[PDB]
Amino acid sequence: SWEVGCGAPVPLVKCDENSPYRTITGDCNNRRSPALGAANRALARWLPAEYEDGLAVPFGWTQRKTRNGFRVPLAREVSNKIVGYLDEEGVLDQNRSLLFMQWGQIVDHDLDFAPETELGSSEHSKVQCEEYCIQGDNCFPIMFPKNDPKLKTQGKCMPFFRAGFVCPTPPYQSLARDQINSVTSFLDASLVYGSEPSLASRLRNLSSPLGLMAVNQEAWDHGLAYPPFNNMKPSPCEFINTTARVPCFQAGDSRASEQILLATVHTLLLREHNRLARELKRLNPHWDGEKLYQEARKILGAFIQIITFRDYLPIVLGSEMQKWIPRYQGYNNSVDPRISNVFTFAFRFGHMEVPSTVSRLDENYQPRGPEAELPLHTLFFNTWRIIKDGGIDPLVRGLLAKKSKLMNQNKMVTSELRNKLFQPTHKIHGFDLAAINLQRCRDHGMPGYNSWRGFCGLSQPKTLKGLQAVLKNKILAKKLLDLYKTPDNIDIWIGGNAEPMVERGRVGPLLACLLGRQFQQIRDGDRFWWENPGVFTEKQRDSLQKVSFSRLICDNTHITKVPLHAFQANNYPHDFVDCSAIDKLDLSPWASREN
Amino acid sequence: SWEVGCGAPVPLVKCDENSPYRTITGDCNNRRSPALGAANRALARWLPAEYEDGLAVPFGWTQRKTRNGFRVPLAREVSNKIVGYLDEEGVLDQNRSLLFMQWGQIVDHDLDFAPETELGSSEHSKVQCEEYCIQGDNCFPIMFPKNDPKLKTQGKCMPFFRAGFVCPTPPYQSLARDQINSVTSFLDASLVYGSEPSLASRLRNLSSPLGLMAVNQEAWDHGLAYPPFNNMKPSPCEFINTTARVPCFQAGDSRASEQILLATVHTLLLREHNRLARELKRLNPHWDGEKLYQEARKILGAFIQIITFRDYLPIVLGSEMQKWIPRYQGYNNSVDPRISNVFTFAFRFGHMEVPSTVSRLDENYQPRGPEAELPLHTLFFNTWRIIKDGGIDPLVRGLLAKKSKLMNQNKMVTSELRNKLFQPTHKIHGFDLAAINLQRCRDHGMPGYNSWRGFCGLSQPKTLKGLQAVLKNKILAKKLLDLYKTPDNIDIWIGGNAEPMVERGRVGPLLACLLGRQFQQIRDGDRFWWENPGVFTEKQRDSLQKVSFSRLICDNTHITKVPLHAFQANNYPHDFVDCSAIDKLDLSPWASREN
Ligand code: HEM
Ligand code: HEM
Ligand SMILES: *[C@@H]1O[C@H](CO)[C@@H](O[C@@H]2O[C@H](CO)[C@@H](O[C@H]3O[C@H](CO)[C@@H](O)[C@H](O)[C@@H]3O)[C@H](O)[C@H]2NC(C)=O)[C@H](O)[C@H]1NC(C)=O
Ligand SMILES: *[C@@H]1O[C@H](CO)[C@@H](O[C@@H]2O[C@H](CO)[C@@H](O[C@H]3O[C@H](CO)[C@@H](O)[C@H](O)[C@@H]3O)[C@H](O)[C@H]2NC(C)=O)[C@H](O)[C@H]1NC(C)=O
Ligand SMILES: *[C@@H]1O[C@H](CO)[C@@H](O[C@@H]2O[C@H](CO)[C@@H](O)[C@H](O)[C@H]2NC(C)=O)[C@H](O)[C@H]1NC(C)=O
Ligand SMILES: *[C@@H]1O[C@H](CO)[C@@H](O[C@@H]2O[C@H](CO)[C@@H](O)[C@H](O)[C@H]2NC(C)=O)[C@H](O)[C@H]1NC(C)=O
Ligand SMILES: *[C@@H]1O[C@H](CO)[C@@H](O[C@@H]2O[C@H](CO)[C@@H](O)[C@H](O)[C@H]2NC(C)=O)[C@H](O)[C@H]1NC(C)=O
Ligand SMILES: *[C@@H]1O[C@H](CO)[C@@H](O[C@@H]2O[C@H](CO)[C@@H](O)[C@H](O)[C@H]2NC(C)=O)[C@H](O)[C@H]1NC(C)=O
Ligand SMILES: *[C@@H]1O[C@H](CO)[C@@H](O)[C@H](O)[C@H]1NC(C)=O
Ligand SMILES: *[C@@H]1O[C@H](CO)[C@@H](O)[C@H](O)[C@H]1NC(C)=O
Ligand SMILES: [Ca+2]
Ligand SMILES: [Ca+2]
């Protein structure tokens, strides 16, 4: 039967039909099922939801209940007992640029986003959670264990809310809970253009009839632009440095400002749009604005798919790609292009690759000034360090020359992320990303480590001597279940990352499986995948295989010497070459001849 | 309506059932229904709650919904246009002592306390209501009209927190909201003995046999008692004058020290008890420390009741007393003894009987001192002016010799109360009792004015020519609805207080009703009312029939000249006689004898 409980707000689009262009909402990619893969629809489930009341309450809610006959360890304890580490000494991946984790957070962002629930924009229930730590309704506090340093400093807990679900979000019911994905499952640069038409036009210079993205009129970077400042007052980017008074940037996506390096690449993508539109305009003079805006948007998306599948995914899945992402072979009209719930917890591995400091290099890539080397922690929702401090050129260099953190079984998440996190809703710099990642698993109802090791075809260990075989490490295998008590209860985020990394990759057996599949599907089920016949022509493609992130730099900044392979470890004199040694993306084929 | 309801936090006890003594909590009075009339229950309702969303948002909080098709007047605006005046001359009630005014406030405090809501305990939210004046779930501001003084001087609005409701304290749903009465509904002098098991005890000197209430050990008044100071740091009493640094008095009821005059009678009471206990002890040598309290505590309540129904009510109601309060025909157990909500707004008529200043007289009832007449406003929460500047003797001569404030359709409430009211919570001296009152009606869900004229079975005016016939004042009737636009929307408090006084009484036909009905009720449903058989003996009564407030003054102060009728006007020295001229209350009939 179909006890299809309740429905949906949803921008209802009617498709065009023959149009050679992508819709904003994400609809119509599919002819037999339109809304399949669009924004604001429940995340998909590869495996049945696992809640305490089997229907919607998270494990670790009604203390006096267990799973599989045990008490689920507090989120914050899992973090301390197993996730943290004090000494940053030589904890850096050595064949991976910082760019390697920045491009990650970007592709993640183009694929998913489960809105937190906040009804409340005047509200004090908003406060019964930050100030009293009382579980009830959407408030699901992250309690602290004994002798947790935070206790003498911030309170009894860390405010935390449940992720919105389909249908409303308020007085919730009926069938097994499924949370929403407010973005589009396609690598369609929807972080640059948006997911709701309403906002996709706000982003637009629509007074000049030459298709351009709206840009800042009050701030500059050597005659180069920054995204437009966001409207809404009580923005956090202002709070950080009350004096400076420079707000967050506004982009197709709403997380663009979390950290100064994220904002930076958001600027390159915004910038590449314009070089492309202007260019096309000059070549196809008769072309009209709307035509420019989308031929550009199309060029750009092709870009995010080629960098992502040619340069980025090989080196994550490593030797497990050929196995999961077979070589492309046409639109498989019948493949779920949607993002599964788990994916959004399996692609969080990146969290473990964020270094504890971001540095600014000066034209010869030398640490510039008295404060070129800052703490990751003083960079969340920070834009003034950009507007009022050298622009983003010195930051882009950092990304090219400095390396990312390497996932170490006994150095998982830097404290800058596990102890001093800034949440846009709050005032302190004392939240924890690891703990959040852990309850958030429970909020969404994920099944356990074993039920997932299963989904992939790997042994489901039960003996502590068994966990050791997989994790290839005793003391980790031990600390782990002195907490969970059984392999069947370990949270996927942690349980997955605990595994050693596959050959020449950056994630193990289970993560490789969950990512591999997901990615293949949004690539085989996307009607606009660039390589699929019709979306572009033989000659347009030929020109597209020559793009590179290195080239992206050369055309939108004043950097001059850059690496051929922006994603691997590169020292400054040798591994760098002046831009004229690198391919250019010939937009000639885009030329349209009249008669 | 015979149905179920929210059974929230209430001290639970077991009815002994044959104890000749009232419980402190008020519980067990009623045999068939225990709770009835108990403290911390929430207020009898005589009419439907009227709220804007039919459940809990005050009328006039959502800035666009109406009442009966019309916008509700700002709380403060009514106060400026109607309630206030600038000449305090000729405003004195020629035939009513200041004491009149004062006994009314004692009888009220014995009957009802609706706690306003929250505190927080280190809160960022008390701050969001006294700075930005932002509306929000517990904070319902009082906004300042345009062209109002307070604007230039205090700010945008003055703080106001809705009053406590019954299932919760914090935030939620389903039934018409009701406020809590934290004091026993019977006239049992519990402003003295308290309404809580735990406080009730602490308030007594258990370090002796003698069964007495504990007195202050740091300061005495000419060899006489004072109540003990209150622990509470961030005390209002000390803030007034830091140099003096004299804390608030601790009494059976919180408000005990809002003003020098109230805190005063609060001592005569306290002293009355210790006397009785002491006295009883010698006539009954073998009694118990414990038997001493409540034989006295019984003697005391009975005292309140008498003065209230016998010298006091007969002059508030006047020719409407027989109509509502017939002669006692004994305990009618089928009568709801609880205080209705409206009573708590009907009784505030006394807010308009407070004169502009408070005096201090020398033993010849001559102004005593360089600063005898003190403007009222510098007396809210004042204690040092007692303990340190004179004693209570000078004040009590004040009450007996000075006059109250006559209610006058033109001068409603003193400016010492309209503009300069002090609240314990906050710092400045610029609040408005009148505006609090009006705001407070909408908070308590008070049905409109007409909905009450009807309830008492009186003409309901619809037109302006209609409202003039009742108020017997054209101009007023006009000012009133140039603001309310319709008789239906006039806030009870004012509308009630607007009607011209009844014969030989001090309230209009409406209030006469409300107040008459309420009082009769707490008297006919109180199993312990004194005239009731069993409660006190035939002889015991015959001796209680002579208690007088003049005698109270005598036995417990060093005043020797007092009037027979302490409630009306009395000029010195013709209306004053020697304390030897007034009766004494013989306790000989309380003499128990062995076999
Ligand atoms: C600071 C934060 C980052 C940089 C130090 C960072 C980085 C990444 C990378 C590199 C990712 C994948 C390659 C990635 C995936 C996802 N993140 Fe994370 N992130 C920072 C801070 C946050 C915060 C706060 C959140 C919200 C967490 C919550 O669940 O409440 C966050 C989330 C995510 C996320 C969820 C997307 C979604 O489903 O809505 C990823 C897939 N990041 N991040
Ligand atoms: C100062 C205050 C007084 C002295 C000038 C004063 C006096 C009286 C008298 C004489 C009353 C009866 C004849 C009387 C009744 C009630 N009051 Fe009032 N009062 C002073 C100050 C206040 C403040 C502040 C309040 C709270 C107002 C609010 O609505 O928030 C107050 C209340 C009341 C009240 C309500 C009891 C209740 O239902 O909770 C009376 C019946 N007074 N007062
Ligand atoms: C708040 O944001 C301010 C930006 O508007 C920032 O002010 C600037 O920072 C420093 C003050 O210490 C000065 O800048 C110089 O600092 C180093 C030397 O330490 C130089 O190498 C740099 O080139 C740079 O010129 C600026 O004078 C100052 N500007 C202003 C207006 O103060 C503050 O640092 C921020 N304050 C906080 C607490 O975050
Ligand atoms: C703060 O409270 C003080 C009382 O605790 C009060 O001071 C009192 O008033 C004056 C001191 O200024 C003294 O009274 C008079 O004393 C002799 C008469 O005997 C006169 O010659 C003096 O000039 C003075 O007028 C009291 O002794 C003094 N009380 C105490 C305990 O010191 C202040 O007036 C109060 N301040 C405010 C702002 O209210
Ligand atoms: C660092 O990573 C690079 C990137 O993969 C490695 O070079 C690749 O090596 C594989 C075979 O192992 C080849 O398919 C490619 O020709 C190489 N790609 C690039 C971009 O160079 C390199 O071997 C790694 N460095 C070390 C020391 O292992
Ligand atoms: C929209 O596009 C127009 C066209 O370029 C922008 O106007 C130019 O702005 C630059 C720098 O701000 C000036 O040097 C030129 O003089 C302007 N050109 C013309 C023809 O007026 C405009 O700034 C853009 N606005 C937004 C919000 O992006
Ligand atoms: C002041 O008010 C009281 C009560 O209203 C008056 O009391 C009545 O006075 C008249 C004499 O004029 C008689 O009807 C009664 O004997 C009194 N009853 C009471 C309870 O006192 C009082 O007398 C008024 N002042 C004057 C001079 O009448
Ligand atoms: C509690 O009651 C006792 C019993 O009388 C009080 O004790 C006497 O207090 C007087 C007055 O200060 C002293 O002169 C006596 O010396 C005390 N006698 C005894 C046996 O203690 C006591 O002061 C009272 N305390 C309180 C706080 O009320
Ligand atoms: C797509 O589905 C078809 C239909 O069953 C099948 O030929 C094949 O498994 C899929 N093709 C690709 C390229 O994935
Ligand atoms: C007792 O109260 C009941 C209920 O209000 C009422 O019927 C009647 O007035 C009273 N009975 C007598 C005999 O007075
Ligand atoms: Ca997308
Ligand atoms: Ca009482």
Side-chain angles (χ1 to χ4, degrees), chain B residues 356-372:
Chain B
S356 74
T357 81
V358 156
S359 252
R360 257 111 86 293
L361 314 175
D362 167 26
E363 22 245 312
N364 279 160
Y365 285 88
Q366 293 298 62
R368 91 165 244 325
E371 320 184 317

PDB file of all heavy atoms in Angstrom, chain B residues 356-372:
ATOM      1  N   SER B 356      -1.212  62.103  47.308  1.00  0.00           N
ATOM      2  CA  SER B 356       0.120  62.471  46.819  1.00  0.00           C
ATOM      3  C   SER B 356       1.297  62.353  47.783  1.00  0.00           C
ATOM      4  O   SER B 356       2.414  62.067  47.352  1.00  0.00           O
ATOM      5  CB  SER B 356       0.102  63.902  46.294  1.00  0.00           C
ATOM      6  OG  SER B 356       0.051  64.830  47.365  1.00  0.00           O
ATOM      7  N   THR B 357       1.059  62.576  49.074  1.00  0.00           N
ATOM      8  CA  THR B 357       2.141  62.535  50.052  1.00  0.00           C
ATOM      9  C   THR B 357       1.853  61.657  51.257  1.00  0.00           C
ATOM     10  O   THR B 357       0.716  61.269  51.487  1.00  0.00           O
ATOM     11  CB  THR B 357       2.408  63.918  50.611  1.00  0.00           C
ATOM     12  OG1 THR B 357       1.443  64.195  51.635  1.00  0.00           O
ATOM     13  CG2 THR B 357       2.272  64.964  49.528  1.00  0.00           C
ATOM     14  N   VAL B 358       2.900  61.383  52.036  1.00  0.00           N
ATOM     15  CA  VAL B 358       2.812  60.584  53.264  1.00  0.00           C
ATOM     16  C   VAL B 358       3.429  61.402  54.407  1.00  0.00           C
ATOM     17  O   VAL B 358       4.580  61.824  54.319  1.00  0.00           O
ATOM     18  CB  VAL B 358       3.569  59.238  53.118  1.00  0.00           C
ATOM     19  CG1 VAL B 358       3.969  58.714  54.478  1.00  0.00           C
ATOM     20  CG2 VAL B 358       2.684  58.212  52.414  1.00  0.00           C
ATOM     21  N   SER B 359       2.662  61.611  55.477  1.00  0.00           N
ATOM     22  CA  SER B 359       3.098  62.412  56.632  1.00  0.00           C
ATOM     23  C   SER B 359       3.653  61.674  57.846  1.00  0.00           C
ATOM     24  O   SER B 359       3.508  60.459  57.976  1.00  0.00           O
ATOM     25  CB  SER B 359       1.943  63.291  57.118  1.00  0.00           C
ATOM     26  OG  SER B 359       2.168  64.651  56.800  1.00  0.00           O
ATOM     27  N   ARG B 360       4.272  62.444  58.742  1.00  0.00           N
ATOM     28  CA  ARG B 360       4.862  61.946  59.991  1.00  0.00           C
ATOM     29  C   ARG B 360       4.545  62.930  61.127  1.00  0.00           C
ATOM     30  O   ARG B 360       4.961  64.086  61.086  1.00  0.00           O
ATOM     31  CB  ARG B 360       6.385  61.800  59.844  1.00  0.00           C
ATOM     32  CG  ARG B 360       6.877  60.370  59.643  1.00  0.00           C
ATOM     33  CD  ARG B 360       7.440  60.119  58.247  1.00  0.00           C
ATOM     34  NE  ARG B 360       8.854  60.473  58.101  1.00  0.00           N
ATOM     35  CZ  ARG B 360       9.341  61.709  58.170  1.00  0.00           C
ATOM     36  NH1 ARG B 360       8.533  62.735  58.388  1.00  0.00           N
ATOM     37  NH2 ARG B 360      10.641  61.918  58.005  1.00  0.00           N
ATOM     38  N   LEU B 361       3.838  62.472  62.156  1.00  0.00           N
ATOM     39  CA  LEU B 361       3.461  63.366  63.243  1.00  0.00           C
ATOM     40  C   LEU B 361       4.085  63.119  64.569  1.00  0.00           C
ATOM     41  O   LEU B 361       4.341  61.981  64.996  1.00  0.00           O
ATOM     42  CB  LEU B 361       1.948  63.340  63.424  1.00  0.00           C
ATOM     43  CG  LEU B 361       1.039  63.442  62.203  1.00  0.00           C
ATOM     44  CD1 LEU B 361      -0.414  63.284  62.601  1.00  0.00           C
ATOM     45  CD2 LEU B 361       1.260  64.754  61.468  1.00  0.00           C
ATOM     46  N   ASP B 362       4.323  64.215  65.227  1.00  0.00           N
ATOM     47  CA  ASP B 362       4.941  64.367  66.570  1.00  0.00           C
ATOM     48  C   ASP B 362       3.950  64.050  67.720  1.00  0.00           C
ATOM     49  O   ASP B 362       2.744  64.273  67.516  1.00  0.00           O
ATOM     50  CB  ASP B 362       5.409  65.801  66.707  1.00  0.00           C
ATOM     51  CG  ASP B 362       5.769  66.149  68.136  1.00  0.00           C
ATOM     52  OD1 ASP B 362       6.126  65.222  68.903  1.00  0.00           O
ATOM     53  OD2 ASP B 362       5.690  67.331  68.483  1.00  0.00           O
ATOM     54  N   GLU B 363       4.291  63.559  68.916  1.00  0.00           N
ATOM     55  CA  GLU B 363       3.200  63.116  69.840  1.00  0.00           C
ATOM     56  C   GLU B 363       2.019  64.082  70.089  1.00  0.00           C
ATOM     57  O   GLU B 363       1.137  63.737  70.859  1.00  0.00           O
ATOM     58  CB  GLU B 363       3.786  62.757  71.190  1.00  0.00           C
ATOM     59  CG  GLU B 363       5.126  63.395  71.432  1.00  0.00           C
ATOM     60  CD  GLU B 363       6.244  62.372  71.535  1.00  0.00           C
ATOM     61  OE1 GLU B 363       6.076  61.391  72.276  1.00  0.00           O
ATOM     62  OE2 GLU B 363       7.284  62.561  70.885  1.00  0.00           O
ATOM     63  N   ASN B 364       1.961  65.261  69.492  1.00  0.00           N
ATOM     64  CA  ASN B 364       0.841  66.151  69.732  1.00  0.00           C
ATOM     65  C   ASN B 364       0.125  66.202  68.386  1.00  0.00           C
ATOM     66  O   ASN B 364      -0.714  67.070  68.128  1.00  0.00           O
ATOM     67  CB  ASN B 364       1.353  67.527  70.131  1.00  0.00           C
ATOM     68  CG  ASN B 364       1.741  67.595  71.584  1.00  0.00           C
ATOM     69  OD1 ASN B 364       2.490  68.478  71.997  1.00  0.00           O
ATOM     70  ND2 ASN B 364       1.219  66.667  72.378  1.00  0.00           N
ATOM     71  N   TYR B 365       0.472  65.234  67.539  1.00  0.00           N
ATOM     72  CA  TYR B 365      -0.066  65.135  66.196  1.00  0.00           C
ATOM     73  C   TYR B 365       0.211  66.445  65.488  1.00  0.00           C
ATOM     74  O   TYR B 365      -0.670  67.059  64.884  1.00  0.00           O
ATOM     75  CB  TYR B 365      -1.552  64.841  66.235  1.00  0.00           C
ATOM     76  CG  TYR B 365      -1.852  63.410  66.593  1.00  0.00           C
ATOM     77  CD1 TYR B 365      -1.978  63.027  67.920  1.00  0.00           C
ATOM     78  CD2 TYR B 365      -2.035  62.441  65.608  1.00  0.00           C
ATOM     79  CE1 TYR B 365      -2.286  61.721  68.263  1.00  0.00           C
ATOM     80  CE2 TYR B 365      -2.346  61.126  65.947  1.00  0.00           C
ATOM     81  CZ  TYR B 365      -2.472  60.778  67.280  1.00  0.00           C
ATOM     82  OH  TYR B 365      -2.807  59.499  67.657  1.00  0.00           O
ATOM     83  N   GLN B 366       1.463  66.869  65.602  1.00  0.00           N
ATOM     84  CA  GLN B 366       1.956  68.081  64.980  1.00  0.00           C
ATOM     85  C   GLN B 366       3.001  67.578  63.996  1.00  0.00           C
ATOM     86  O   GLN B 366       3.643  66.567  64.251  1.00  0.00           O
ATOM     87  CB  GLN B 366       2.602  68.971  66.041  1.00  0.00           C
ATOM     88  CG  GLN B 366       1.619  69.516  67.065  1.00  0.00           C
ATOM     89  CD  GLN B 366       0.562  70.400  66.422  1.00  0.00           C
ATOM     90  OE1 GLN B 366      -0.215  69.944  65.577  1.00  0.00           O
ATOM     91  NE2 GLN B 366       0.535  71.673  66.808  1.00  0.00           N
ATOM     92  N   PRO B 367       3.175  68.253  62.849  1.00  0.00           N
ATOM     93  CA  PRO B 367       4.189  67.748  61.912  1.00  0.00           C
ATOM     94  C   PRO B 367       5.504  67.591  62.665  1.00  0.00           C
ATOM     95  O   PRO B 367       6.030  68.567  63.188  1.00  0.00           O
ATOM     96  CB  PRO B 367       4.261  68.846  60.854  1.00  0.00           C
ATOM     97  CG  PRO B 367       2.880  69.410  60.858  1.00  0.00           C
ATOM     98  CD  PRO B 367       2.552  69.484  62.336  1.00  0.00           C
ATOM     99  N   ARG B 368       6.044  66.383  62.741  1.00  0.00           N
ATOM    100  CA  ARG B 368       7.280  66.252  63.488  1.00  0.00           C
ATOM    101  C   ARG B 368       8.558  66.247  62.660  1.00  0.00           C
ATOM    102  O   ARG B 368       8.923  65.254  62.018  1.00  0.00           O
ATOM    103  CB  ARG B 368       7.240  65.023  64.413  1.00  0.00           C
ATOM    104  CG  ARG B 368       7.776  63.734  63.824  1.00  0.00           C
ATOM    105  CD  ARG B 368       8.047  62.685  64.903  1.00  0.00           C
ATOM    106  NE  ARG B 368       9.457  62.306  65.048  1.00  0.00           N
ATOM    107  CZ  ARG B 368      10.343  62.228  64.052  1.00  0.00           C
ATOM    108  NH1 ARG B 368       9.999  62.517  62.800  1.00  0.00           N
ATOM    109  NH2 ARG B 368      11.583  61.825  64.305  1.00  0.00           N
ATOM    110  N   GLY B 369       9.239  67.382  62.670  1.00  0.00           N
ATOM    111  CA  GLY B 369      10.489  67.439  61.955  1.00  0.00           C
ATOM    112  C   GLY B 369      10.608  68.410  60.810  1.00  0.00           C
ATOM    113  O   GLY B 369       9.616  68.964  60.336  1.00  0.00           O
ATOM    114  N   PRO B 370      11.849  68.618  60.344  1.00  0.00           N
ATOM    115  CA  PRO B 370      12.255  69.502  59.246  1.00  0.00           C
ATOM    116  C   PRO B 370      11.747  68.969  57.906  1.00  0.00           C
ATOM    117  O   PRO B 370      11.624  69.711  56.924  1.00  0.00           O
ATOM    118  CB  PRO B 370      13.773  69.452  59.331  1.00  0.00           C
ATOM    119  CG  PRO B 370      14.015  68.004  59.737  1.00  0.00           C
ATOM    120  CD  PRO B 370      13.006  67.843  60.843  1.00  0.00           C
ATOM    121  N   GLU B 371      11.467  67.669  57.882  1.00  0.00           N
ATOM    122  CA  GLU B 371      10.989  66.998  56.682  1.00  0.00           C
ATOM    123  C   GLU B 371       9.912  65.982  57.073  1.00  0.00           C
ATOM    124  O   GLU B 371      10.086  64.769  56.918  1.00  0.00           O
ATOM    125  CB  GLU B 371      12.164  66.300  55.979  1.00  0.00           C
ATOM    126  CG  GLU B 371      13.457  67.124  55.976  1.00  0.00           C
ATOM    127  CD  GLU B 371      14.586  66.460  55.203  1.00  0.00           C
ATOM    128  OE1 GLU B 371      14.769  65.232  55.347  1.00  0.00           O
ATOM    129  OE2 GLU B 371      15.300  67.173  54.460  1.00  0.00           O
ATOM    130  N   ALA B 372       8.799  66.499  57.585  1.00  0.00           N
ATOM    131  CA  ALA B 372       7.677  65.673  58.009  1.00  0.00           C
ATOM    132  C   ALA B 372       6.866  65.107  56.841  1.00  0.00           C
ATOM    133  O   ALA B 372       6.585  63.907  56.810  1.00  0.00           O
ATOM    134  CB  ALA B 372       6.769  66.475  58.919  1.00  0.00           C
TER     135      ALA B 372
END
